[PDB]
Amino acid sequence: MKYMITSKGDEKSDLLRLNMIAGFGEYDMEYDDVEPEIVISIGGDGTFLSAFHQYEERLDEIAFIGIHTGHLGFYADWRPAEADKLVKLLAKGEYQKVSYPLLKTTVKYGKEATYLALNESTVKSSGGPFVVDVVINDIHFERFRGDGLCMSTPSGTTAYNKSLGGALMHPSIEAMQLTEMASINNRVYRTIGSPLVFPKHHVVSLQPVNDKDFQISVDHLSILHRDVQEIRYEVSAKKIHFARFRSFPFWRRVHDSFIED
Amino acid sequence: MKYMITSKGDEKSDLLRLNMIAGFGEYDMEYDDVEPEIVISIGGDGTFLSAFHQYEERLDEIAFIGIHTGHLGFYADWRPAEADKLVKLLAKGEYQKVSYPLLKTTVKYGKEATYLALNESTVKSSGGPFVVDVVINDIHFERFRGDGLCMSTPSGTTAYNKSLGGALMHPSIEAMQLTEMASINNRVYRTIGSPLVFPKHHVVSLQPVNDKDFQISVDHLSILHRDVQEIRYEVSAKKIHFARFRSFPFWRRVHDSFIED
Amino acid sequence: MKYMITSKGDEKSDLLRLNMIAGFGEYDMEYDDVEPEIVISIGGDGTFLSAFHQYEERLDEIAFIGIHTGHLGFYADWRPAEADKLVKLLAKGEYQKVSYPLLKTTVKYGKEATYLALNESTVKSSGGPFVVDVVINDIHFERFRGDGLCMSTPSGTTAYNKSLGGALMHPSIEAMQLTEMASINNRVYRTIGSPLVFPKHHVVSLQPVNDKDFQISVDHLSILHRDVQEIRYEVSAKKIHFARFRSFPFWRRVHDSFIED
Amino acid sequence: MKYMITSKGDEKSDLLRLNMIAGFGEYDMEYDDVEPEIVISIGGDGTFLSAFHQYEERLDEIAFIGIHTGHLGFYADWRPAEADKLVKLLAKGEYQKVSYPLLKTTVKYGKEATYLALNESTVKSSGGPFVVDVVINDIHFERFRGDGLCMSTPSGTTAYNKSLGGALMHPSIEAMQLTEMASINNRVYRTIGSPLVFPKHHVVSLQPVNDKDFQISVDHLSILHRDVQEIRYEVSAKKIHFARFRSFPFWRRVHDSFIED
Numbered sequence A, B, C, D: 001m002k003y004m005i006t007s008k009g010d011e012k013s014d015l016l017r018l019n020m021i022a023g024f025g026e027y028d029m030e031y032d033d034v035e036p037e038i039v040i041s042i043g044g045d046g047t048f049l050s051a052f053h054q055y056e057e058r059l060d061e062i063a064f065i066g067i068h069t070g071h072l073g074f075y076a077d078w079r080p081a082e083a084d085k086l087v088k089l090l091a092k093g094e095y096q097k098v099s100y101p102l103l104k105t106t107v108k109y110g111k112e113a114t115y116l117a118l119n120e121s122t123v124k125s126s127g128g129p130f131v132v133d134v135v136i137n138d139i140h141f142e143r144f145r146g147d148g149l150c151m152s153t154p155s156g157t158t159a160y161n162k163s164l165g166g167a168l169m170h171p172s173i174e175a176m177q178l179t180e181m182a183s184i185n186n187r188v189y190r191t192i193g194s195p196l197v198f199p200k201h202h203v204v205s206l207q208p209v210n211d212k213d214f215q216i217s218v219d220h221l222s223i224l225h226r227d228v229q230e231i232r233y234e235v236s237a238k239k240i241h242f243a244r245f246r247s248f249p250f251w252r253r254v255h256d257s258f259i260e261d
Ligand SMILES: C#CCCCn1c(C)nc2c(N)ncnc21
Pocket: A045, A046, A049, A074, A075, A119, A155, A156, A157, A158, A159, A160
């Protein structure tokens, strides 16, 4: 089928990419970076994120693969020594696929932009103090005052969400998790503190109180949005599809990354 | 139908119980504390827990109701001023039901005991240091050294789980959450730190390394178990059924309990 | 003696300022905002901070006073209803003074700037990832990777330091406290996690590893510094002097601000 | 002078103890475990704690030494390969001493017991819920509801205090640090959350509200106290004296124990 390979760009990932292309040349495989069915990422999880956002409009037609040339990644979870075995099994097909949930972010102005996040989406203020009203399913839940907020996907829980005290969730759970950054809590100002885990169809809305400019990030992309009336979080109806070439359990990936080896 | 009412025992809950019984006497309702179909709890969440464990073997045949005579509870979430309205709508029937997931705990010795938890189940040592090997789906994940561990249901996340830094999960998510109590982390000893959220069919196993006696709690009940080979956590196949007499969203219950009013 | 009064600027603080000036006109008191011996702040703690930094070069010759027209402040800890009593006792003199420690921040480039902080000084990256080597008394302690770091004074511990999990320290302790913002900790990257409390004469040095541009804050002032070789923290030899007109213990100020009333 | 050596009891520490005794036999040194001036601990920090509590009534007349036969300890911070060099320099004398602060715990009943802690002192309930009123310098600060409380010395901050989120304090600071264990915080119940650092002469008092039986620990010793009216914490007037045979900075000891090597 049609495939493409993206590379981190260093000497090591480029040479592995050229070898896989040559290995694919021995099969009924066509290189196409416009309408690929297999997207192979060689480098790290950041390389995988760029590959994901590069083709975030053909997600239902693409199975992703990650190869880590550095340390183990949660998306780039296959070693370079398995590149030849990957070429063989991807060419035969007959492989199984696994799907992870995604986060949908909607930004409304006074004009509405939607984004797809594989890891998380964060909101901070542009200079001044960050104060937003948190609305859960049209119910005002809290007035947050602090550095910012982070809404994470299940597979994104091991990234920025973990550094903010959030829980690690198995990516088979269709949910999103909201965590706080340095919240102010006193007699006057009150936040829940705890991370919040939301199922599908639950809508979390952030609404400004004074300043209406925010620095909004979606995975690696961070942009200053001006004159926004609402930031809207929801579990996406779209999923990212991975090609499953053997068993590498998520909890083992968590152990190998944070505990040992 | 058949019903029963449990009371916290104070003058206030007993008098409300007698008034509801008399109110039920005006309908085709029979008081039966042996095979009830409606279990009404009057008092607090602790009163509701005892009602749950009192009938934990007829869960598929019982719809529970909680009335709080003190502060708002997450299970006793109806005010005493609505007792007359509750009697009317429970007698007519035609009410909808909602179901929350439960936690199954299995204790094995050298002889195996199973327990059902509505909030959480905790493990600590009996005197000496608490060290266990944490096994996730037959994969050794970590060697935990600390005060203990807590596995919580979704509706139990607002209880002891919250005090340990765990996330608040919407009870429509079929999952369990493991949190740590005062873990030792240094160059030699390593724990994940973060709370872990597990879906259905995932089995978390605790296995002793030296001392084989542990103080195991299930909701309010705490017992010393001796000569245990394994503690086994899993999302239960059973659910607790609530009678739904109006809309009181979980996130609103969280706001009313921790934020304001 | 010579005095001056700074105001938050709202109608309420300005009118209280004019009344105290008129009240001071009934005593041997001279208004002088160039070489004052008494600096009275009317507004909030932010108003007090600006008054402090306005006269941070005559600290050994000034006794500060804070009056809060809004909620209770840790520096503006006197109510407006006591303004007349403050005028009387400040004019007589004979009042006792109390001193709080300060934080000295030194920034070195490739050209060296020193700053005095009453609350805290923070360091973050300008866009890219924030990675610094933490050096304690010329000993390399850790390579920090995360959002940033915060070094707080004792009286500053109740401000941003508290939101980052730092401890509240009694301001009679001559020390500084370093806290982390969203640190990355895995098998490869290691931070201490815990807040660190340093005595006098201890020097904490932050040294860049790649990017040499950082957003450095000192209390309310936040500036982008380019081409910095070292950020250097130390407990200042200077102290801020408060005029003590009655007993308002720090721990009571903490209780009134975070617990109740 | 007079000396004694305590051993962890394993084959390795006993043989090192016999070799140091024989090495001391080549000098004007007398073994005396009743009135020693030098107390050498061989094993771990737990071995050092027992040596400290064994002679906690001759603290002003004893210089302590710790040798770790296992991993590095914060009190047993000298390797076995330096035992011969330690014998030489302890026999000559002329060594410098360093002193660490200690924690004084007073327990009052309806009859008053005082204890000296090198690491920390903790309070928990005996079975039932743990609720105490926290009184700081005769001012009611908070009503604590949770698992328990921990008051730590500066050198004890790297032990249980660290596992509870407390800050690491340099042991030259004469202070104590109070940390919370799993506190309940909601609309009804309020705790400060943050760790609290107290200077000398500050008295922290714990007073019961209902149950008057508590499990009180002092370092390794844990005892059930019944019918207690007050638990009283204060920085001790006594200090523990270490013999200083070279420079091993506390922050380096922290790095070697938690960061690397
Ligand atoms: C650059 C950088 C730091 C984050 C790396 N990273 C990414 C891009 N995704 C993940 C993930 N799912 N889990 C852990 N780590 C991750």
